[PDB]
Scaffold this motif. Sequence first.
Motif, short mmCIF file in Angstrom:
data_model
loop_
_atom_site.label_atom_id
_atom_site.label_comp_id
_atom_site.label_asym_id
_atom_site.label_seq_id
_atom_site.Cartn_x
_atom_site.Cartn_y
_atom_site.Cartn_z
N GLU A 159 41.43 21.62 13.63
CA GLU A 159 39.98 21.59 13.47
C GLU A 159 39.46 20.29 12.86
N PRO A 160 40.13 19.64 11.90
CA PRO A 160 39.57 18.40 11.36
C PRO A 160 39.41 17.30 12.40
N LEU A 161 40.21 17.32 13.46
CA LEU A 161 40.16 16.31 14.50
C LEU A 161 39.22 16.69 15.65
N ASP A 162 38.49 17.79 15.54
CA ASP A 162 37.71 18.32 16.65
C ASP A 162 38.58 18.64 17.85
N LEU A 163 39.75 19.21 17.61
CA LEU A 163 40.61 19.74 18.66
C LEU A 163 40.88 21.21 18.40
N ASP A 164 41.17 21.95 19.47
CA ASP A 164 41.38 23.38 19.35
C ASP A 164 42.17 23.87 20.55
N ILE A 165 43.12 24.77 20.30
CA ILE A 165 43.99 25.27 21.35
C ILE A 165 43.30 26.41 22.08
N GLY A 166 43.26 26.33 23.41
CA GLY A 166 42.98 27.48 24.23
C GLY A 166 44.28 28.04 24.78
N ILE A 167 44.43 29.36 24.69
CA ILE A 167 45.67 30.03 25.03
C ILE A 167 45.45 30.88 26.27
N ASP A 168 46.43 30.84 27.18
CA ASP A 168 46.41 31.61 28.42
C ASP A 168 47.65 32.49 28.39
N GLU A 169 47.51 33.70 27.83
CA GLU A 169 48.66 34.57 27.67
C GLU A 169 49.24 34.99 29.01
N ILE A 170 48.41 35.16 30.03
CA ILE A 170 48.90 35.66 31.31
C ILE A 170 49.91 34.69 31.90
N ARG A 171 49.59 33.40 31.89
CA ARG A 171 50.47 32.40 32.48
C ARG A 171 51.43 31.78 31.48
N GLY A 172 51.38 32.19 30.21
CA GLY A 172 52.27 31.64 29.22
C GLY A 172 52.05 30.16 29.02
N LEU A 173 50.89 29.79 28.48
CA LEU A 173 50.50 28.40 28.36
C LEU A 173 49.59 28.21 27.16
N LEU A 174 49.72 27.06 26.50
CA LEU A 174 48.78 26.61 25.49
C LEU A 174 48.37 25.19 25.82
N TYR A 175 47.09 24.88 25.66
CA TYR A 175 46.57 23.56 25.98
C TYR A 175 45.47 23.19 25.01
N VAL A 176 45.39 21.91 24.67
CA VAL A 176 44.37 21.44 23.76
C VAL A 176 43.05 21.29 24.52
N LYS A 177 41.95 21.41 23.79
CA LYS A 177 40.63 21.22 24.35
C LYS A 177 39.69 20.77 23.24
N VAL A 178 38.61 20.10 23.63
CA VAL A 178 37.68 19.55 22.66
C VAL A 178 36.96 20.70 21.96
N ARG A 179 36.92 20.64 20.63
CA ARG A 179 36.32 21.67 19.80
C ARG A 179 34.91 21.32 19.36
#
Length: 86
Positions: A46-66
């Motif tokens: 959060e201090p960097l304005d980044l945040d993980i979006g998680i896709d449990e169905i496909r088993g994936l984590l990816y960064v995105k702008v917060r």
Amino acid sequence: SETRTLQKIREATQELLKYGLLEEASKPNLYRIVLSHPEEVTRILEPLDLDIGIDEIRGLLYVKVRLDETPAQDEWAHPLVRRQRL
DNA sequence: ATATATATATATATATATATATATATATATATATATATATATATATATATATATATATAT
């Protein structure tokens, strides 16, 4: 001396920033740990304005702008995330 | 003085050894040429940040 973030979480966060995503298919140890500590990773990013979006169905984590919730700016701009046009 | 034998000056013939001249074949070094991979340089499209120009607006 002072408290340090758990080694595994630090490794997961550094990997996630380097490659931009984790996958249970090729990195189960880190992917599961991140899902077991979402509040730690989200606090770290959060201090960097980044945040993980998680896709449990496909088993994936990816960064995105917060960045802010639809502020006066209709399109986001971030210092670190340099945009591209393929 | 006579008759015999030998010697001296010069060249030619034959042999020995040294040395040079000629030719060839070889090994070597080298120059060189090529090929490969890598790095480097230039051009174009786009995103990003800086700077300037123009206009508004406060103070005299």
